[PDB]
Amino acid sequence: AQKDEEKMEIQEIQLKEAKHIAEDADRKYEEVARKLVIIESDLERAEERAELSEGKCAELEEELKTVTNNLKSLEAQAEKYS
Amino acid sequence: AQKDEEKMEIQEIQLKEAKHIAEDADRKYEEVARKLVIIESDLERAEERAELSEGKCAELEEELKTVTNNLKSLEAQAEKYS
Amino acid sequence: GKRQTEREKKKKILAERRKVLAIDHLNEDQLREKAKELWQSIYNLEAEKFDLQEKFKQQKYEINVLRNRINDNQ
Amino acid sequence: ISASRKLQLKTLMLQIAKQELEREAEERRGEKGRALSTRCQPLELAGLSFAELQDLCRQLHARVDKVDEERYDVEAKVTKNITEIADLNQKIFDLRGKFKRPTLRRVRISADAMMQALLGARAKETLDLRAHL
Amino acid sequence: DDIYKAAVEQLTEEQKNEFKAAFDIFVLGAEDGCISTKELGKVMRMLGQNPTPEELQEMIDEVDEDGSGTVDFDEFLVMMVRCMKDDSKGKSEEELSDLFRMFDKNADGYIDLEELKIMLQATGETITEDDIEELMKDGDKNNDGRIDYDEFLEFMKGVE
Amino acid sequence: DDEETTALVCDNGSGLVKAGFAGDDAPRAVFPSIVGRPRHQGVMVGMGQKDSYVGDEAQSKRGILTLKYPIEHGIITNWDDMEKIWHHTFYNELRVAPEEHPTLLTEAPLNPKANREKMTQIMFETFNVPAMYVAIQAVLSLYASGRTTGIVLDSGDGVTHNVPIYEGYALPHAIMRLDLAGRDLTDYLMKILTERGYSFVTTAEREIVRDIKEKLCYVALDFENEMATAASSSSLEKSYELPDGQVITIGNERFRCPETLFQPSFIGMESAGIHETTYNSIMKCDIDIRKDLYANNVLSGGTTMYPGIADRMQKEITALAPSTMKIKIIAPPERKYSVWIGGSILASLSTFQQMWISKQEYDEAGPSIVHRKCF
Amino acid sequence: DDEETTALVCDNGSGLVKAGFAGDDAPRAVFPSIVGRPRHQGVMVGMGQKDSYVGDEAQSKRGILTLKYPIEHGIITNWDDMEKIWHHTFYNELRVAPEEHPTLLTEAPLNPKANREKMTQIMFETFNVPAMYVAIQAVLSLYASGRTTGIVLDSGDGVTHNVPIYEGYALPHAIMRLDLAGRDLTDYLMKILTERGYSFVTTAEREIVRDIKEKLCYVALDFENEMATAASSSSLEKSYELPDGQVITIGNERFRCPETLFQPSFIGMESAGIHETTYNSIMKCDIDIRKDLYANNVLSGGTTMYPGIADRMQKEITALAPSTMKIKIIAPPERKYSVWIGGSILASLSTFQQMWISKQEYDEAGPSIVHRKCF
Ligand SMILES: Nc1ncnc2c1ncn2[C@@H]1O[C@H](COP(=O)(O)OP(=O)(O)O)[C@@H](O)[C@H]1O
Ligand SMILES: Nc1ncnc2c1ncn2[C@@H]1O[C@H](COP(=O)(O)OP(=O)(O)O)[C@@H](O)[C@H]1O
Ligand SMILES: [Mg+2]
Ligand SMILES: [Mg+2]
């Protein structure tokens, strides 16, 4: 019985240490979750703004093409009327 | 002595549960570490490419302005020709 | 096209469904009471119109705020 | 930076805002009264016989019809723009706060200190074993 | 300044239970009631309250500059009650919006710095290092050159 | 700006509503005129789901809506939806209450009277404008060109009409209105795309086919040569990416869709193309103003924006017309908004300021005032 | 808390019953849904032996019981046992009488009507709740992610279903329900373990095989390479200690058990894997909302917790989908309780407070009220 009491108290201090380790891990978990949420929100915004920029670039490119071609044709016609 | 032994068994199961907590915490934390790093790298790249597109779009704006002016000139020439 | 409901509502409230009143066919006390009731109705209608004007100002403020937020974020 | 300016600052800002709000409310009420007097003048209470009161009531009823059509117009307008205000407030919530609406929550308040079921199970097993003898 | 400290001077048993819990965790009796700010933050993380490290790091950067680690009771309890969320709904959103649009005279969809400074000076409060450039530093998140209602909330969220 | 009062130059159109204050260069808000009720059930609660998305909002949620245009061919077939579109245009795209602004609507030639009368009745009773005026969509397009003569072919999206004008005197007996327009070209393109395997059926996918038509189709200078070339080489096949991937390749469907304009027999219509109804409209005019109309042929409207139409039409008319006359086709780069620019110019004139239909006049004669002197 | 009234967010599930009051983060009591009568004779007198141990009590005395789940595939096959489970859940795991609390059950899509009607009849007659509402298990999992669009694959333990949603408008014609789930994976693992010598037959040992599956199995990124590697090296063989000793070593059974999800031909099922029924569910949707569904693919349910599934599924869909679209797979760490968290959020909403099926309404229309407007 004496030996068993010894083992009981040893396991008792071990259990307290275990609980503390558990709480520390819990706090770390909450922290990392917060960080991940923030960074992912930033990812959303970054992707969306990238898309906006790409679309606008496309539209401006097309308009440039059209106007340039019209100008070239009218230049040819100016020579013709000369 | 029997009561003490029962106490010991209880402590044993609790220690088991604590180690279980430790392992699951570590696993989830490593997972979130992976996700964090991947998200961060991709966010960096996305911001870079979006800014590149923005610069190209501004250049396109200037090009379009040049073309518009030249078309105005050619149109005036053609109408006077008429 | 089916706009008869809206026009019907507005016109009927204007002419038929309004508080149609005959006022010059009452006794002295009755005519006085009717005139006072109509005066109260007029003043309360003008108060309601002013309150709607204040709400219109608030709506203008809200519309400007929403437009500014959209322009900032889009 | 001092952590002392925040509470006094917010209290003083709240008081100044409340004073401004009540000033604006009283200004609105007074201007409403003045405008209402302008739109419809007050009546008189001396020397009126039946006929002049009848004529005044006819003029008042013509004004009643006028203010009735004015009020019907402004009331339809206010109904439509109050519906618009509700619709656009819901639109703004769906645009910006659509994700914050389910975010405001009350969680992580139970499982943090809920490890005492094992004690109950151990007590039950010990009770059964003791009841055996 | 006065809220948390005054509440400490009229401390309630509701918070005094946790105060004595942290006391027996920290102070063994017949001591100086030290509760070092590093240990204070560590145990605030430990003791089942909200373990937000921002307040802990602020406390570290604010106190225990004497070189001994001793923390006085008044500021310790002030920071203990400040680690929790202590506000009453930040008033009403519609109320504050009306108050700010009364503060807002330009009416261009936002509000400029001049009106905000006028309202702050009309409040009539003392000036410390948290003025002048702290407002500019906090409000300039996207640096739009202006401070709107959203930015006004961003500066001092939870306006009681 | 400030005191004073500016006019609202609205332009209902059919396919794109263009509006803006008088005196500017371009319309302030341009958005499709579609009103689409949701068609599925909807399970999320409190999402703030409305009962009808109008304008440009329904071009983003079109995946779960059933878009339906309220204007079929110039005429208006669904008055409640049109009222909704006008209400949106006034309050959300311009944010100006109509109680303090004159309006200048536009209407195609030869339209039913009841449409115009109902339009003015709505504008005066529901929105309660101070004064409104209705103008023919071709005279404005002639204003915008800065001319005073010329025969204008305004090929919109609903209806194509061809109004000849000389020295400011319109010729009412020479207006040739044809109901082939951009919408029929969209339907025909959607019908010939099925020859390669791509099937678009839903009313939402009509918008995708419209985008294909706008971005890829062009008018061939000579039809048979293009048909022969596209059948031998592969230099014409241009690809396009759908809203979800799966790129498609358009072959000789590119110049066959807009060819319907010059051969309306493709969609089964009997009448002659836009190249021959202009010549017929000219020949109905007097013998002494035909040279001026030949020299000042004006193009307008959206559908005349196809790349290469100003040359095909000139070639066709030169083939039809006598060899001595000079054929010139005015195709300004701002073709799409030509009608609205002309509307702004007309509303900004001082001489025009007394032609509005004032509200007291409507109160005295009823909605039939529009057919009277105030046209 | 105090005055007022909180709602009970129960979630029957199939394999684990999850319950708790509305407005929290995690379910209060989670316990297996098994009811096991004793099967041996019993000689000790006065031991206080009950006739049926339910819930988590029968996972400790499982050595002398015959556990039998009352829910086979979403549907409920044994109503008395299910009533017993509900009674236990209300009275012993939450200790709140149901007479004073609304309930929010959850149900898989495409389930038999009679199951739902019997569920509501039980809740209103036996337990006598004030008001109950039945919700589809996928919409809640979409609530919990804080999205409003996306296609959610909720691979539970009974049945795997794949509900696509856009802008809050569910698409009823694109729900693909497949009956392969965690239970079939447990049976297949128990069947392939026999290739090494370990035979598990008793219904109690199915729990041991389930524990093996949970703790050891993982989804391979590439199946053939893993099959080749496990057949040459021995770096995969992980050992596990049975409830009595005699450790066992699992070789290439580790990634072959959960591979059945992507190749249902292993257990003889004809249909395609969970990697291809998602793509088919997307392709049934309209052409304009496919990009959003591609970008917001959501995973939920217990069985989607295998280590390495969020990469295998993304690789497979990227192989199937067009190369331009971006494929993103949302796999929150709180996957198992995602449905219940969403249920709590939905029950906590103010807009939802008038959708409950009030008892007087049931008294007037009978149990068939659930199919009516109050869905
Ligand atoms: N750039 C373009 N190329 C080819 N077709 C176009 C182009 N832009 C518009 N369209 C066609 O013209 C129509 C718009 O015509 P529009 O002039 O807006 O009609 P409305 O007279 O009703 O305003 C669209 O339906 C489209 O089919
Ligand atoms: N960590 C895990 N790893 C692998 N499989 C798991 C894990 N947890 C649970 N499962 C499987 O998922 C099932 C539980 O699924 P659950 O989501 O509870 O189903 P239901 O939808 O009925 O609640 C279990 O039967 C088990 O087979
Ligand atoms: Mg037009
Ligand atoms: Mg489930």
Curated annotation (Swiss-Prot), chains A, B:
One of its GO terms (cellular component) is actin filament. Induction: Induced by hypoxia. This induction is reversed by exposure to normal levels of oxygen. GO terms for molecular function: actin filament binding; identical protein binding; protein heterodimerization activity; protein homodimerization activity. Keywords: Acetylation, Actin-binding, Coiled coil, Cytoplasm, Cytoskeleton, Muscle protein, Phosphoprotein. One of its GO terms (biological process) is cardiac muscle contraction. The keyword Chloroplast does not apply. It comes from the Eukaryota. The modification Phosphoserine is found at S41, S53, S73. Disulfide bonds: none annotated. It is found in: Cytoplasm, Cytoskeleton. Homodimer. Heterodimer of an alpha (TPM1, TPM3 or TPM4) and a beta (TPM2) chain. Interacts with HRG (via the HRR domain); the interaction contributes to the antiangiogenic properties of the histidine/proline-rich region (HRR) of HRG. Interacts (via N-terminus) with LMOD2 (via N-terminus) and TMOD1 (via N-terminus). Binds to actin filaments in muscle and non-muscle cells. Plays a central role, in association with the troponin complex, in the calcium dependent regulation of vertebrate striated muscle contraction. Smooth muscle contraction is regulated by interaction with caldesmon. In non-muscle cells is implicated in stabilizing cytoskeleton actin filaments. Belongs to the tropomyosin family. The molecule is in a coiled coil structure that is formed by 2 polypeptide chains. The sequence exhibits a prominent seven-residues periodicity. This is Tropomyosin alpha-1 chain. It comes from Sus scrofa (Pig). The gene is TPM1. The chain holds residues 134 to 215 of 284 of the full protein.
Curated annotation (Swiss-Prot), chain E:
GO terms for molecular function: actin filament binding; calcium ion binding; calcium-dependent protein binding; protein homodimerization activity; troponin I binding; troponin T binding. InterPro entries: CALM/Myosin/TropC-like (IPR050230), EF-hand-dom_pair (IPR011992), EF_Hand_1_Ca_BS (IPR018247), EF_hand_dom (IPR002048). Ca(2+) 3 binds at D140, N142, D144, R146, E151. Gene3D superfamilies: EF-hand (1.10.238.10). It comes from the Eukaryota. The keyword Calcium applies. Ca(2+) 1 binds at D64, D66, S68, T70, E75. One of its GO terms (cellular component) is cardiac Troponin complex. Ca(2+) 2 binds at D104, N106, D108, Y110, E115. GO terms for biological process: cardiac muscle contraction; regulation of muscle filament sliding speed; skeletal muscle contraction; transition between fast and slow fiber; ventricular cardiac muscle tissue morphogenesis. This is Troponin C, slow skeletal and cardiac muscles. It comes from Sus scrofa.
